[PDB]
Paper text:
Here, we present the detailed interactions between human [name] (HSA) and equine [name] (ESA) with a derivative of [name], 1-O-myristoyl-sn-glycerol-2,3-cyclic phosphorodithioate (Myr-2S-[name]). The crystal structures of the investigated albumin complexes show a different number and location of Myr-2S-[name] binding sites in both proteins, indicating a species-dependent manner of [name] binding.
The structure of the ESA–Myr-2S-[name] complex, determined to the resolution of 2.48 Å in P61 space group with a single monomer in the asymmetric unit, includes only one binding site of Myr-2S-[name]. This binding site is located in the cleft created between helices h2-II, h3-II of subdomain IIA, and helices h8-II, h9-II of subdomain IIB, which is formed also with a contribution of the helices h5-III, h6-III of subdomain IIIA and the short loop between them. The latter residues, together with Asp323, create a closed ‘buckle’ over the binding pocket which covers the aliphatic fragment of the ligand. This binding pocket was also identified in HSA studies as FA6 and, comparing the conformation of Myr-2S-[name] and FA in this cavity, they present an analogous conformation. Most probably, Val482 to Ala481 substitution and thus, the presence of a residue with reduced size of side chain, increases the availability of backbone nitrogen atoms, placed at the initial section of the helix (Leu480 and Ala481), for the creation of hydrogen bonds with negatively charged molecules in this compartment.
Numbering used by the authors: 4 to 583
Protein backbone atom coordinates (compact mmCIF):
# COMPACT_ATOMS: atom_id res chain seq x y z
CA UNK A 1 0.00 0.00 0.00
CA UNK A 2 2.53 2.55 1.23
CA UNK A 3 6.00 1.16 0.85
CA UNK A 4 7.59 4.10 2.73
CA UNK A 5 5.24 3.61 5.69
CA UNK A 6 6.00 -0.17 5.66
CA UNK A 7 9.79 0.37 5.76
CA UNK A 8 9.45 3.20 8.27
CA UNK A 9 7.34 0.83 10.46
CA UNK A 10 9.71 -2.07 10.09
CA UNK A 11 12.97 -0.28 10.64
CA UNK A 12 12.20 2.41 13.22
CA UNK A 13 13.13 6.04 12.94
CA UNK A 14 16.83 5.88 13.76
CA UNK A 15 17.61 3.12 11.30
CA UNK A 16 15.23 4.47 8.68
CA UNK A 17 17.04 7.81 8.83
CA UNK A 18 20.54 6.32 8.96
CA UNK A 19 19.85 4.21 5.89
CA UNK A 20 18.32 7.12 4.00
CA UNK A 21 21.24 9.42 4.88
CA UNK A 22 23.60 6.62 3.69
CA UNK A 23 21.65 6.21 0.45
CA UNK A 24 21.60 9.96 -0.43
CA UNK A 25 25.30 10.29 0.50
CA UNK A 26 26.23 7.52 -1.97
CA UNK A 27 24.01 8.74 -4.77
CA UNK A 28 25.08 12.41 -4.27
CA UNK A 29 28.65 12.42 -3.12
CA UNK A 30 29.51 16.03 -3.94
CA UNK A 31 26.41 17.52 -2.06
CA UNK A 32 27.13 19.32 1.30
CA UNK A 33 26.15 17.68 4.60
CA UNK A 34 23.45 20.38 5.31
CA UNK A 35 21.42 19.75 2.18
CA UNK A 36 21.46 15.97 2.97
CA UNK A 37 20.09 16.45 6.49
CA UNK A 38 17.20 18.54 5.24
CA UNK A 39 16.58 15.96 2.57
CA UNK A 40 16.47 13.11 5.06
CA UNK A 41 14.36 14.96 7.58
CA UNK A 42 11.82 15.80 4.86
CA UNK A 43 11.60 12.26 3.55
CA UNK A 44 11.34 10.99 7.16
CA UNK A 45 8.51 13.51 7.85
CA UNK A 46 6.68 12.22 4.78
CA UNK A 47 7.08 8.67 5.91
CA UNK A 48 5.45 9.48 9.26
CA UNK A 49 2.62 11.21 7.65
CA UNK A 50 2.31 8.15 5.37
CA UNK A 51 2.47 5.76 8.38
CA UNK A 52 -0.62 7.36 9.93
CA UNK A 53 -2.72 7.72 6.67
CA UNK A 54 -1.36 5.37 4.01
CA UNK A 55 -3.94 6.63 1.53
CA UNK A 56 -2.55 10.19 1.63
CA UNK A 57 -1.37 11.95 -1.54
CA UNK A 58 1.60 10.00 -3.03
CA UNK A 59 2.03 7.57 -0.10
CA UNK A 60 1.48 4.71 -2.66
CA UNK A 61 4.49 5.75 -4.87
CA UNK A 62 7.57 3.58 -4.96
CA UNK A 63 10.56 4.52 -2.85
CA UNK A 64 12.81 5.23 -5.82
CA UNK A 65 10.17 7.54 -7.13
CA UNK A 66 9.96 9.35 -3.84
CA UNK A 67 13.77 9.39 -3.27
CA UNK A 68 14.77 10.28 -6.72
CA UNK A 69 12.12 13.04 -6.80
CA UNK A 70 13.66 14.40 -3.70
CA UNK A 71 17.26 14.06 -4.83
CA UNK A 72 16.26 15.85 -7.98
CA UNK A 73 15.19 18.97 -6.04
CA UNK A 74 18.89 19.49 -5.20
CA UNK A 75 20.78 17.57 -8.04
CA UNK A 76 19.43 19.85 -10.77
CA UNK A 77 22.35 22.03 -9.89
CA UNK A 78 24.52 21.32 -12.86
CA UNK A 79 27.28 23.42 -11.32
CA UNK A 80 27.77 20.91 -8.60
CA UNK A 81 26.85 17.43 -10.14
CA UNK A 82 26.92 17.72 -14.00
CA UNK A 83 25.90 14.22 -15.32
CA UNK A 84 23.46 13.64 -12.50
CA UNK A 85 21.16 16.47 -13.60
CA UNK A 86 20.26 14.55 -16.84
CA UNK A 87 19.38 11.56 -14.68
CA UNK A 88 16.67 13.83 -13.25
CA UNK A 89 14.74 14.11 -16.53
CA UNK A 90 14.15 10.27 -16.66
CA UNK A 91 11.37 8.34 -14.94
CA UNK A 92 12.03 5.26 -12.92
CA UNK A 93 13.59 2.80 -13.37
CA UNK A 94 15.77 4.60 -15.96
CA UNK A 95 16.44 7.37 -13.49
CA UNK A 96 17.86 5.03 -10.81
CA UNK A 97 19.92 3.21 -13.30
CA UNK A 98 21.35 6.53 -14.43
CA UNK A 99 22.23 7.47 -10.90
CA UNK A 100 23.88 4.12 -10.33
CA UNK A 101 25.88 4.31 -13.52
CA UNK A 102 27.22 7.68 -12.38
CA UNK A 103 28.34 6.86 -8.78
CA UNK A 104 32.07 7.88 -8.31
CA UNK A 105 34.40 5.21 -6.96
CA UNK A 106 37.23 7.65 -6.49
CA UNK A 107 36.02 11.20 -5.64
CA UNK A 108 39.46 11.82 -3.90
CA UNK A 109 37.91 13.80 -1.05
CA UNK A 110 40.00 15.11 1.75
CA UNK A 111 41.37 12.33 3.98
CA UNK A 112 39.56 11.76 7.28
CA UNK A 113 41.69 13.41 10.03
CA UNK A 114 40.67 12.56 13.58
CA UNK A 115 40.47 15.77 15.74
CA UNK A 116 39.80 14.52 19.25
CA UNK A 117 39.13 17.90 20.89
CA UNK A 118 36.82 19.52 18.32
CA UNK A 119 35.01 16.26 17.52
CA UNK A 120 34.31 15.40 21.15
CA UNK A 121 32.58 18.79 21.51
CA UNK A 122 30.48 18.16 18.39
CA UNK A 123 29.68 14.78 19.79
CA UNK A 124 28.26 16.36 22.94
CA UNK A 125 26.31 19.37 21.55
CA UNK A 126 24.53 16.96 19.13
CA UNK A 127 25.35 13.23 18.99
CA UNK A 128 22.69 12.19 16.37
CA UNK A 129 24.00 14.90 14.00
CA UNK A 130 27.57 13.75 14.79
CA UNK A 131 26.74 10.15 13.93
CA UNK A 132 24.90 11.32 10.80
CA UNK A 133 28.09 13.08 9.71
CA UNK A 134 30.20 9.87 10.07
CA UNK A 135 27.56 8.09 7.87
CA UNK A 136 27.84 10.98 5.48
CA UNK A 137 31.60 11.08 5.23
CA UNK A 138 32.01 7.31 4.92
CA UNK A 139 29.10 6.69 2.51
CA UNK A 140 30.18 9.33 0.11
CA UNK A 141 33.69 7.96 -0.05
CA UNK A 142 32.42 4.42 -0.56
CA UNK A 143 29.19 4.60 -2.55
CA UNK A 144 28.65 0.86 -2.73
CA UNK A 145 29.33 0.41 0.98
CA UNK A 146 27.03 -2.30 2.53
CA UNK A 147 24.28 0.03 3.91
CA UNK A 148 23.24 -1.69 7.12
CA UNK A 149 26.85 -2.53 7.91
CA UNK A 150 27.75 1.14 7.88
CA UNK A 151 25.11 1.67 10.60
CA UNK A 152 26.83 -0.99 12.69
CA UNK A 153 30.16 0.81 12.22
CA UNK A 154 28.53 4.03 13.27
CA UNK A 155 27.62 2.36 16.60
CA UNK A 156 31.32 1.47 17.01
CA UNK A 157 32.41 5.01 16.18
CA UNK A 158 29.94 6.20 18.86
CA UNK A 159 31.25 3.62 21.36
CA UNK A 160 34.79 4.84 20.66
CA UNK A 161 33.89 8.53 21.51
CA UNK A 162 31.66 7.55 24.47
CA UNK A 163 34.74 5.69 26.03
CA UNK A 164 37.35 8.37 25.19
CA UNK A 165 36.06 11.92 25.32
CA UNK A 166 35.56 12.13 29.10
CA UNK A 167 38.93 10.43 29.87
CA UNK A 168 42.16 12.45 30.35
CA UNK A 169 44.46 11.70 27.36
CA UNK A 170 42.02 11.93 24.40
CA UNK A 171 44.18 11.20 21.42
CA UNK A 172 45.84 8.34 23.39
CA UNK A 173 42.58 6.45 23.91
CA UNK A 174 41.01 7.73 20.70
CA UNK A 175 43.39 7.79 17.72
CA UNK A 176 44.39 4.04 17.60
CA UNK A 177 40.73 3.08 17.79
CA UNK A 178 39.79 5.30 14.91
CA UNK A 179 42.76 4.07 12.86
CA UNK A 180 41.64 0.49 13.54
CA UNK A 181 38.07 1.50 12.58
CA UNK A 182 39.39 2.86 9.32
CA UNK A 183 41.02 -0.57 8.56
CA UNK A 184 37.68 -2.21 9.01
CA UNK A 185 35.84 0.33 6.84
CA UNK A 186 38.36 0.01 4.01
CA UNK A 187 38.33 -3.78 4.07
CA UNK A 188 34.47 -3.92 4.38
CA UNK A 189 33.96 -1.55 1.42
CA UNK A 190 36.34 -3.58 -0.66
CA UNK A 191 34.29 -6.74 0.32
CA UNK A 192 30.94 -5.19 -0.70
CA UNK A 193 32.37 -3.60 -3.86
CA UNK A 194 33.49 -7.03 -4.98
CA UNK A 195 29.85 -8.18 -4.64
CA UNK A 196 28.36 -5.38 -6.66
CA UNK A 197 31.09 -5.67 -9.34
CA UNK A 198 30.36 -9.40 -9.65
CA UNK A 199 26.66 -8.50 -10.20
CA UNK A 200 27.68 -5.77 -12.74
CA UNK A 201 30.31 -7.73 -14.68
CA UNK A 202 29.25 -11.42 -14.38
CA UNK A 203 25.66 -11.69 -13.13
CA UNK A 204 23.78 -13.41 -10.33
CA UNK A 205 25.16 -16.90 -10.99
CA UNK A 206 28.62 -15.72 -10.30
CA UNK A 207 27.51 -14.34 -6.98
CA UNK A 208 25.63 -17.48 -6.02
CA UNK A 209 28.57 -19.67 -6.97
CA UNK A 210 30.82 -17.45 -4.82
CA UNK A 211 28.38 -17.52 -1.97
CA UNK A 212 27.82 -21.28 -2.05
CA UNK A 213 31.57 -21.84 -1.84
CA UNK A 214 32.09 -19.47 1.02
CA UNK A 215 28.98 -20.33 3.01
CA UNK A 216 29.80 -24.05 2.70
CA UNK A 217 33.28 -23.43 4.10
CA UNK A 218 31.76 -21.42 6.94
CA UNK A 219 28.88 -23.86 7.72
CA UNK A 220 30.21 -27.26 6.78
CA UNK A 221 27.64 -29.12 9.01
CA UNK A 222 24.71 -27.51 7.35
CA UNK A 223 23.19 -29.54 4.66
CA UNK A 224 22.56 -28.24 1.19
CA UNK A 225 18.95 -27.14 1.84
CA UNK A 226 20.17 -24.71 4.48
CA UNK A 227 23.14 -23.38 2.49
CA UNK A 228 21.03 -23.07 -0.67
CA UNK A 229 18.33 -21.09 0.97
CA UNK A 230 20.77 -18.86 2.78
CA UNK A 231 22.53 -18.25 -0.51
CA UNK A 232 19.31 -17.46 -2.31
CA UNK A 233 18.31 -14.93 0.35
CA UNK A 234 21.77 -13.39 0.88
CA UNK A 235 22.18 -13.00 -2.91
CA UNK A 236 18.85 -11.20 -3.04
CA UNK A 237 19.91 -9.01 -0.08
CA UNK A 238 23.18 -7.92 -1.71
CA UNK A 239 21.44 -7.56 -5.10
CA UNK A 240 19.10 -5.00 -3.54
CA UNK A 241 21.88 -3.16 -1.78
CA UNK A 242 24.11 -3.04 -4.86
CA UNK A 243 21.10 -1.65 -6.78
CA UNK A 244 20.64 1.11 -4.13
CA UNK A 245 17.46 -0.34 -2.59
CA UNK A 246 18.91 0.15 0.98
CA UNK A 247 15.64 0.03 3.00
CA UNK A 248 14.40 -3.12 1.30
CA UNK A 249 17.95 -4.50 1.62
CA UNK A 250 17.91 -3.97 5.41
CA UNK A 251 14.45 -5.55 5.92
CA UNK A 252 15.59 -8.65 3.97
CA UNK A 253 18.86 -8.74 5.82
CA UNK A 254 16.92 -8.69 9.15
CA UNK A 255 14.67 -11.51 8.01
CA UNK A 256 17.67 -13.60 7.09
CA UNK A 257 19.59 -13.18 10.35
CA UNK A 258 16.33 -14.13 12.10
CA UNK A 259 16.06 -17.32 10.01
CA UNK A 260 19.69 -18.21 10.55
CA UNK A 261 19.36 -17.87 14.34
CA UNK A 262 16.06 -19.81 14.51
CA UNK A 263 17.99 -22.63 12.63
CA UNK A 264 21.24 -22.23 14.53
CA UNK A 265 21.66 -25.98 15.38
CA UNK A 266 21.07 -27.05 11.82
CA UNK A 267 23.67 -24.48 10.48
CA UNK A 268 26.62 -23.97 12.89
CA UNK A 269 27.64 -24.19 16.53
CA UNK A 270 29.63 -21.00 16.07
CA UNK A 271 26.52 -18.82 15.63
CA UNK A 272 25.60 -19.18 19.28
CA UNK A 273 27.53 -16.07 20.23
CA UNK A 274 26.13 -14.10 17.23
CA UNK A 275 22.53 -14.91 17.92
CA UNK A 276 22.39 -13.73 21.60
CA UNK A 277 23.00 -10.15 20.36
CA UNK A 278 20.96 -7.22 18.95
CA UNK A 279 20.03 -6.73 15.30
CA UNK A 280 23.01 -4.95 13.76
CA UNK A 281 25.65 -6.60 15.97
CA UNK A 282 24.01 -9.91 15.24
CA UNK A 283 23.98 -9.49 11.49
CA UNK A 284 27.53 -8.34 11.63
CA UNK A 285 28.72 -11.28 13.68
CA UNK A 286 27.01 -13.81 11.36
CA UNK A 287 28.59 -12.14 8.35
CA UNK A 288 32.09 -12.43 9.85
CA UNK A 289 31.51 -15.72 11.70
CA UNK A 290 34.43 -18.11 12.09
CA UNK A 291 34.36 -21.38 10.25
CA UNK A 292 32.71 -24.28 12.11
CA UNK A 293 34.55 -27.62 12.73
CA UNK A 294 34.32 -30.29 10.03
CA UNK A 295 31.84 -33.12 10.69
CA UNK A 296 32.93 -36.75 11.00
CA UNK A 297 30.31 -37.80 8.29
CA UNK A 298 31.52 -35.99 5.15
CA UNK A 299 30.87 -38.25 2.14
CA UNK A 300 33.58 -39.60 -0.16
CA UNK A 301 33.06 -37.52 -3.26
CA UNK A 302 34.59 -39.60 -5.96
CA UNK A 303 32.02 -42.32 -5.54
CA UNK A 304 29.32 -39.84 -6.75
CA UNK A 305 31.17 -37.24 -8.89
CA UNK A 306 33.69 -39.48 -10.74
CA UNK A 307 32.62 -43.15 -10.52
CA UNK A 308 28.83 -43.09 -10.75
CA UNK A 309 27.37 -44.38 -14.05
CA UNK A 310 24.49 -41.87 -13.79
CA UNK A 311 26.34 -38.48 -13.90
CA UNK A 312 25.47 -37.13 -17.35
CA UNK A 313 21.77 -37.70 -16.46
CA UNK A 314 21.97 -36.25 -12.95
CA UNK A 315 23.74 -33.26 -14.73
CA UNK A 316 21.65 -32.55 -17.91
CA UNK A 317 18.45 -32.55 -15.82
CA UNK A 318 19.51 -29.65 -13.57
CA UNK A 319 23.12 -28.73 -14.14
CA UNK A 320 23.21 -25.83 -11.74
CA UNK A 321 21.71 -27.84 -8.85
CA UNK A 322 24.09 -30.68 -9.53
CA UNK A 323 27.11 -28.36 -9.85
CA UNK A 324 25.93 -26.43 -6.83
CA UNK A 325 25.95 -29.70 -4.95
CA UNK A 326 29.40 -30.53 -6.21
CA UNK A 327 30.57 -27.08 -5.26
CA UNK A 328 28.99 -27.39 -1.75
CA UNK A 329 30.59 -30.78 -1.07
CA UNK A 330 34.06 -29.81 -2.28
CA UNK A 331 33.89 -26.45 -0.42
CA UNK A 332 32.71 -27.61 2.95
CA UNK A 333 35.71 -29.92 3.20
CA UNK A 334 38.30 -27.33 1.95
CA UNK A 335 38.32 -24.29 4.24
CA UNK A 336 42.05 -24.46 3.35
CA UNK A 337 41.27 -23.34 -0.25
CA UNK A 338 40.41 -19.78 -1.38
CA UNK A 339 36.94 -19.10 -2.74
CA UNK A 340 38.28 -18.32 -6.17
CA UNK A 341 40.26 -21.56 -6.18
CA UNK A 342 37.10 -23.58 -5.38
CA UNK A 343 35.47 -21.88 -8.36
CA UNK A 344 38.27 -22.64 -10.76
CA UNK A 345 37.85 -26.17 -9.51
CA UNK A 346 34.12 -26.19 -10.16
CA UNK A 347 34.48 -24.55 -13.72
CA UNK A 348 36.88 -27.40 -14.41
CA UNK A 349 34.41 -30.00 -13.20
CA UNK A 350 31.68 -28.39 -15.38
CA UNK A 351 33.93 -28.10 -18.44
CA UNK A 352 34.97 -31.71 -17.96
CA UNK A 353 31.33 -32.93 -17.95
CA UNK A 354 30.39 -30.86 -21.08
CA UNK A 355 33.27 -32.57 -22.88
CA UNK A 356 32.70 -36.10 -21.50
CA UNK A 357 28.91 -36.28 -21.69
CA UNK A 358 29.03 -35.41 -25.45
CA UNK A 359 31.40 -38.36 -26.11
CA UNK A 360 31.02 -42.04 -27.07
CA UNK A 361 31.70 -43.51 -23.52
CA UNK A 362 31.43 -40.71 -20.85
CA UNK A 363 32.38 -42.44 -17.56
CA UNK A 364 35.76 -43.56 -18.90
CA UNK A 365 36.30 -39.90 -19.86
CA UNK A 366 35.37 -38.28 -16.45
CA UNK A 367 36.73 -41.07 -14.21
CA UNK A 368 39.92 -38.93 -13.80
CA UNK A 369 38.30 -35.55 -13.31
CA UNK A 370 39.60 -35.02 -9.70
CA UNK A 371 43.13 -35.42 -11.02
CA UNK A 372 42.66 -32.32 -13.12
CA UNK A 373 42.42 -30.29 -9.83
CA UNK A 374 45.89 -31.02 -8.53
CA UNK A 375 47.59 -28.41 -10.67
CA UNK A 376 44.99 -25.78 -9.88
CA UNK A 377 45.68 -26.32 -6.24
CA UNK A 378 49.51 -26.38 -6.42
CA UNK A 379 50.00 -22.99 -8.23
CA UNK A 380 48.52 -20.63 -5.70
CA UNK A 381 49.85 -22.74 -2.81
CA UNK A 382 53.35 -22.25 -4.06
CA UNK A 383 52.69 -18.59 -4.92
CA UNK A 384 51.68 -17.96 -1.35
CA UNK A 385 54.68 -19.87 0.05
CA UNK A 386 56.92 -17.71 -2.11
CA UNK A 387 55.34 -14.41 -1.16
CA UNK A 388 55.27 -15.39 2.46
CA UNK A 389 58.96 -16.43 2.51
CA UNK A 390 59.84 -13.09 0.97
CA UNK A 391 57.73 -11.16 3.39
CA UNK A 392 59.15 -12.95 6.52
CA UNK A 393 62.75 -12.40 5.30
CA UNK A 394 62.53 -8.64 4.43
CA UNK A 395 59.37 -7.20 6.06
CA UNK A 396 56.28 -5.08 5.10
CA UNK A 397 58.11 -2.10 3.60
CA UNK A 398 60.50 -4.00 1.32
CA UNK A 399 57.75 -6.47 0.44
CA UNK A 400 55.55 -3.62 -0.65
CA UNK A 401 58.39 -2.35 -2.73
CA UNK A 402 58.81 -5.62 -4.46
CA UNK A 403 55.09 -5.56 -5.35
CA UNK A 404 55.31 -1.98 -6.46
CA UNK A 405 58.01 -3.12 -8.88
CA UNK A 406 56.00 -6.22 -9.99
CA UNK A 407 52.87 -4.34 -10.72
CA UNK A 408 54.52 -1.25 -12.23
CA UNK A 409 56.28 -3.62 -14.69
CA UNK A 410 53.00 -5.35 -15.54
CA UNK A 411 51.10 -2.08 -15.97
CA UNK A 412 53.43 0.99 -16.25
CA UNK A 413 50.52 3.02 -17.80
CA UNK A 414 48.77 3.10 -14.39
CA UNK A 415 49.18 6.34 -12.46
CA UNK A 416 51.93 6.33 -9.81
CA UNK A 417 49.57 6.91 -6.83
CA UNK A 418 47.45 3.95 -7.74
CA UNK A 419 50.35 1.57 -8.22
CA UNK A 420 51.69 2.73 -4.81
CA UNK A 421 48.30 2.12 -3.21
CA UNK A 422 48.06 -1.34 -4.71
CA UNK A 423 51.51 -2.47 -3.69
CA UNK A 424 51.05 -1.03 -0.23
CA UNK A 425 47.68 -2.70 0.18
CA UNK A 426 49.06 -6.01 -1.01
CA UNK A 427 51.96 -5.80 1.35
CA UNK A 428 49.42 -5.27 4.11
CA UNK A 429 47.78 -8.57 2.99
CA UNK A 430 51.16 -10.10 3.48
CA UNK A 431 51.22 -8.86 7.11
CA UNK A 432 47.69 -10.22 7.70
CA UNK A 433 48.04 -13.60 6.03
CA UNK A 434 51.61 -14.87 6.31
CA UNK A 435 51.62 -15.16 10.04
CA UNK A 436 48.58 -17.44 10.06
CA UNK A 437 48.73 -21.17 10.52
CA UNK A 438 49.90 -22.54 7.12
CA UNK A 439 46.55 -24.01 6.04
CA UNK A 440 44.88 -20.58 6.57
CA UNK A 441 47.36 -18.61 4.48
CA UNK A 442 46.04 -19.58 0.99
CA UNK A 443 42.54 -18.48 1.75
CA UNK A 444 43.53 -15.34 3.60
CA UNK A 445 45.91 -14.32 0.80
CA UNK A 446 43.73 -15.05 -2.29
CA UNK A 447 40.47 -13.81 -0.82
CA UNK A 448 42.19 -10.51 0.07
CA UNK A 449 43.95 -10.32 -3.30
CA UNK A 450 40.54 -10.73 -4.97
CA UNK A 451 39.46 -7.55 -3.22
CA UNK A 452 42.54 -5.50 -4.07
CA UNK A 453 42.44 -6.64 -7.67
CA UNK A 454 38.81 -5.69 -7.82
CA UNK A 455 39.63 -2.30 -6.46
CA UNK A 456 42.20 -1.88 -9.33
CA UNK A 457 39.62 -3.04 -11.91
CA UNK A 458 37.04 -0.61 -10.65
CA UNK A 459 39.50 2.24 -10.86
CA UNK A 460 40.31 1.01 -14.36
CA UNK A 461 36.58 1.14 -15.28
CA UNK A 462 36.68 4.87 -14.87
CA UNK A 463 40.19 5.63 -16.06
CA UNK A 464 41.28 3.02 -18.52
CA UNK A 465 45.02 2.80 -19.48
CA UNK A 466 45.96 -0.77 -20.44
CA UNK A 467 44.34 -3.48 -22.59
CA UNK A 468 46.08 -6.05 -20.33
CA UNK A 469 44.29 -4.67 -17.27
CA UNK A 470 40.92 -4.74 -19.15
CA UNK A 471 41.59 -8.30 -20.32
CA UNK A 472 42.16 -9.54 -16.74
CA UNK A 473 39.39 -7.48 -15.16
CA UNK A 474 36.69 -8.78 -17.56
CA UNK A 475 37.50 -12.25 -18.62
CA UNK A 476 36.23 -14.01 -15.49
CA UNK A 477 36.04 -13.69 -11.75
CA UNK A 478 37.69 -17.01 -11.03
CA UNK A 479 40.53 -16.32 -13.47
CA UNK A 480 41.38 -12.76 -12.28
CA UNK A 481 44.18 -13.50 -9.93
CA UNK A 482 45.96 -16.01 -12.12
CA UNK A 483 45.60 -13.68 -15.11
CA UNK A 484 47.16 -10.71 -13.23
CA UNK A 485 49.82 -13.10 -12.00
CA UNK A 486 50.87 -14.04 -15.53
CA UNK A 487 51.29 -10.54 -16.86
CA UNK A 488 55.03 -10.00 -17.47
CA UNK A 489 56.70 -6.71 -18.34
CA UNK A 490 54.57 -4.81 -20.89
CA UNK A 491 57.07 -4.73 -23.84
CA UNK A 492 54.79 -2.25 -25.79
CA UNK A 493 55.53 0.55 -23.26
CA UNK A 494 57.99 3.25 -24.21
CA UNK A 495 59.91 4.35 -21.22
CA UNK A 496 58.62 7.51 -19.64
CA UNK A 497 60.71 10.60 -20.37
CA UNK A 498 63.27 11.38 -17.72
CA UNK A 499 62.25 14.32 -15.50
CA UNK A 500 64.99 14.98 -12.89
CA UNK A 501 62.56 16.81 -10.56
CA UNK A 502 60.47 13.63 -10.11
CA UNK A 503 63.40 12.04 -8.30
CA UNK A 504 64.60 15.17 -6.55
CA UNK A 505 63.90 15.43 -2.80
CA UNK A 506 63.71 18.46 -0.46
CA UNK A 507 63.65 19.28 3.22
CA UNK A 508 59.74 19.31 3.35
CA UNK A 509 59.87 15.46 3.42
CA UNK A 510 61.64 15.59 6.78
CA UNK A 511 58.52 16.69 8.64
CA UNK A 512 56.30 13.88 7.30
CA UNK A 513 55.46 10.93 9.64
CA UNK A 514 57.18 7.63 8.70
CA UNK A 515 54.44 6.23 6.50
CA UNK A 516 54.15 9.37 4.33
CA UNK A 517 57.92 9.48 3.84
CA UNK A 518 57.50 5.86 2.78
CA UNK A 519 54.81 6.76 0.27
CA UNK A 520 57.07 9.47 -1.27
CA UNK A 521 60.03 7.08 -1.69
CA UNK A 522 57.75 4.35 -3.04
CA UNK A 523 56.33 6.88 -5.57
CA UNK A 524 59.90 7.51 -6.66
CA UNK A 525 60.42 3.73 -6.85
CA UNK A 526 57.37 3.40 -9.22
CA UNK A 527 58.71 6.33 -11.28
CA UNK A 528 62.14 4.70 -11.34
CA UNK A 529 60.53 1.57 -12.96
CA UNK A 530 58.46 3.68 -15.36
CA UNK A 531 61.67 5.20 -16.82
CA UNK A 532 63.82 1.98 -16.70
CA UNK A 533 61.38 -0.91 -17.02
CA UNK A 534 63.95 -3.68 -17.61
CA UNK A 535 65.88 -2.84 -14.44
CA UNK A 536 65.82 -5.89 -12.14
CA UNK A 537 64.13 -5.91 -8.78
CA UNK A 538 67.51 -5.76 -7.05
CA UNK A 539 69.04 -2.86 -9.03
CA UNK A 540 65.96 -0.92 -7.96
CA UNK A 541 66.46 -2.06 -4.40
CA UNK A 542 70.01 -0.91 -4.28
CA UNK A 543 69.16 2.45 -5.89
CA UNK A 544 66.25 2.88 -3.45
CA UNK A 545 68.69 1.97 -0.65
CA UNK A 546 70.90 4.81 -1.76
CA UNK A 547 67.92 7.22 -1.88
CA UNK A 548 66.84 6.32 1.66
CA UNK A 549 70.37 6.84 3.02
CA UNK A 550 70.49 10.23 1.48
CA UNK A 551 67.08 11.34 2.79
CA UNK A 552 68.03 10.19 6.26
CA UNK A 553 71.35 12.03 6.11
CA UNK A 554 69.92 15.29 4.87
CA UNK A 555 67.02 15.16 7.32
CA UNK A 556 69.60 15.00 10.13
CA UNK A 557 71.59 17.98 8.90
CA UNK A 558 71.94 21.54 10.40
CA UNK A 559 70.90 22.88 6.96
CA UNK A 560 68.60 20.31 5.44
CA UNK A 561 67.99 22.09 2.14
CA UNK A 562 71.69 22.79 1.46
CA UNK A 563 72.28 19.06 1.97
CA UNK A 564 69.41 18.16 -0.37
CA UNK A 565 70.38 20.77 -2.99
CA UNK A 566 74.00 19.67 -3.04
CA UNK A 567 73.71 15.92 -3.04
CA UNK A 568 70.25 15.24 -4.53
CA UNK A 569 71.16 15.83 -8.15
CA UNK A 570 74.46 13.80 -7.95
CA UNK A 571 72.38 10.95 -6.60
CA UNK A 572 69.79 11.42 -9.30
CA UNK A 573 72.25 11.21 -12.22
CA UNK A 574 74.33 8.39 -10.84
CA UNK A 575 71.32 6.23 -10.00
CA UNK A 576 70.27 6.34 -13.72
CA UNK A 577 73.56 4.55 -14.55
CA UNK A 578 72.69 1.85 -11.96
CA UNK A 579 69.49 0.83 -13.82
CA UNK A 580 70.85 -0.10 -17.33
C1 LIG B 1 18.10 -20.98 -6.17
C2 LIG B 1 19.31 -21.32 -5.32
C3 LIG B 1 20.27 -22.31 -6.00
C4 LIG B 1 21.68 -22.20 -5.40
C5 LIG B 1 22.67 -23.19 -6.03
C6 LIG B 1 23.08 -22.79 -7.46
C7 LIG B 1 24.37 -21.97 -7.52
C8 LIG B 1 25.08 -22.10 -8.87
C9 LIG B 1 26.31 -23.00 -8.76
C10 LIG B 1 26.97 -23.22 -10.11
C11 LIG B 1 28.46 -23.55 -10.00
C12 LIG B 1 29.09 -23.52 -11.40
C13 LIG B 1 30.61 -23.49 -11.37
C14 LIG B 1 31.10 -22.07 -11.48
O1 LIG B 1 32.03 -21.67 -10.79
O2 LIG B 1 30.46 -21.15 -12.41
C15 LIG B 1 30.14 -19.81 -12.02
C16 LIG B 1 31.25 -18.94 -12.54
C17 LIG B 1 31.21 -18.83 -14.07
O3 LIG B 1 32.21 -17.84 -14.33
P1 LIG B 1 32.48 -16.96 -13.01
S1 LIG B 1 32.46 -15.06 -13.49
S2 LIG B 1 34.13 -17.47 -12.11
O4 LIG B 1 31.32 -17.58 -12.09
Amino acid sequence: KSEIAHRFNDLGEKHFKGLVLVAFSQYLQQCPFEDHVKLVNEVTEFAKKCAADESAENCDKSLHTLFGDKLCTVATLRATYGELADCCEKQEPERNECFLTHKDDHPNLPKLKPEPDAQCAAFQEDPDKFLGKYLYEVARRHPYFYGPELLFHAEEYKADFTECCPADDKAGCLIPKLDALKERILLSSAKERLKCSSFQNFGERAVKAWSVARLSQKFPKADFAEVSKIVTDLTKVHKECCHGDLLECADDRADLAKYICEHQDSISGKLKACCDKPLLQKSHCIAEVKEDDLPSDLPALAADFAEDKEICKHYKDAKDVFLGTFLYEYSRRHPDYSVSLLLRIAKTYEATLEKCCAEADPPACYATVFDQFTPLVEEPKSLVKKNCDLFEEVGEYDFQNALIVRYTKKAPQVSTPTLVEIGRTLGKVGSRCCKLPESERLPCSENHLALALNRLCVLHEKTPVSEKITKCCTDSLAERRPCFSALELDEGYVPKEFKAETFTFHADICTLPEDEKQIKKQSALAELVKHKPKATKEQLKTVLGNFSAFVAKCCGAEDKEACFAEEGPKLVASSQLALA
